[PDB]
Ligand binder design. Structure first.
Ligand SMILES: CN1N=C(N)c2cn([C@@H]3O[C@H](COP(=O)(O)O)[C@@H](O)[C@H]3O)c3ncnc1c23
Ligand SMILES: CN1N=C(N)c2cn([C@@H]3O[C@H](COP(=O)(O)O)[C@@H](O)[C@H]3O)c3ncnc1c23
Lengths: 125, 127
């Protein structure tokens, strides 16, 4: 059974929290979902090393999500970023520009599509 | 000359623009500041500068994917890091940045809005 690490804004804001729950619920079909500040950081870094794939929802700007992505790229992890363009935001150049189409992927989606997007990525992975 | 890479929110919000310019100015005293095609060019140019950099300085008060990402890449390259956070903002700093501190290779310092130059001074003559 493969490991999935999911990334989503917390102190950047909990606006998309309910959408994170849907993503996590869907990911459970595709693997085990892995996901006092030092302990938080070390436990997360531990789980990040274990993960076979990293999935982030990057619509809500977040330091932690970005940092997780950064450590994940350096660890050679396959990454999927999901961004909602209809949110009115322009995605961070550093995230969007990291997309190489294989190891680092960034997918634009509509709020109601999230499940079908996840299925599409994993049915190809 | 010594190279400094500076990180600050752009697409996460420009609330702290002025404070970055203040930081950049002071950093110029301690070395060359590398940070003054599309997004792919921006990422590639920035990774190149990050690799060259001797030290990484980030203002982490405004939440930002890019800043976090840069800090993540920087840790993995083994760069010395300094994060500055402003508790006056009312925000609670991300656990992942605050928890990433080891007090030498990765420092996270709290500051008040008039202390920014004096905080930067402290780090560089202890560097
Ligand atoms: C209590 N707490 N606080 C966080 N800020 C915090 C951040 N994170 C991780 O970092 C990301 C959120 O970063 P922030 O939005 O900066 O909070 C999430 O993807 C989490 O995996 C956490 N994981 C467990 N507990 C956490 C946190
Ligand atoms: C045009 N543009 N847009 C960005 N979002 C953007 C982000 N960044 C880098 O990423 C950090 C800001 O990321 P975001 O706040 O997510 O935009 C800064 O510290 C910059 O070094 C950039 N560097 C040059 N040009 C940029 C950007």
């Amino acid at each position: 059974r493969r490991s999935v690490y999911f990334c989503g804004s917390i102190r950047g804001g909990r606006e998309d929290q309910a959408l994170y729950a849907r993503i996590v619920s869907r990911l459970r079909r595709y693997g085990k979902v892995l996901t006092g500040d030092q302990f938080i950081h070390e436990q997360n870094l531990n789980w990040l090393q274990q993960a076979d794939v990293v999935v982030a929802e990057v619509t809500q700007p977040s330091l932690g999500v970005g940092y997780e992505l950064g450590r994940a790229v350096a660890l050679g992890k396959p990454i999927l970023c999901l961004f909602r363009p209809q949110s009115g935001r322009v995605l961070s150049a550093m995230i969007r520009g990291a997309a190489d189409g294989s190891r680092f992927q960034v997918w634009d989606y509509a709020e109601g599509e999230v499940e079908t997007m996840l299925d599409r990525y994993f049915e190809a992975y």
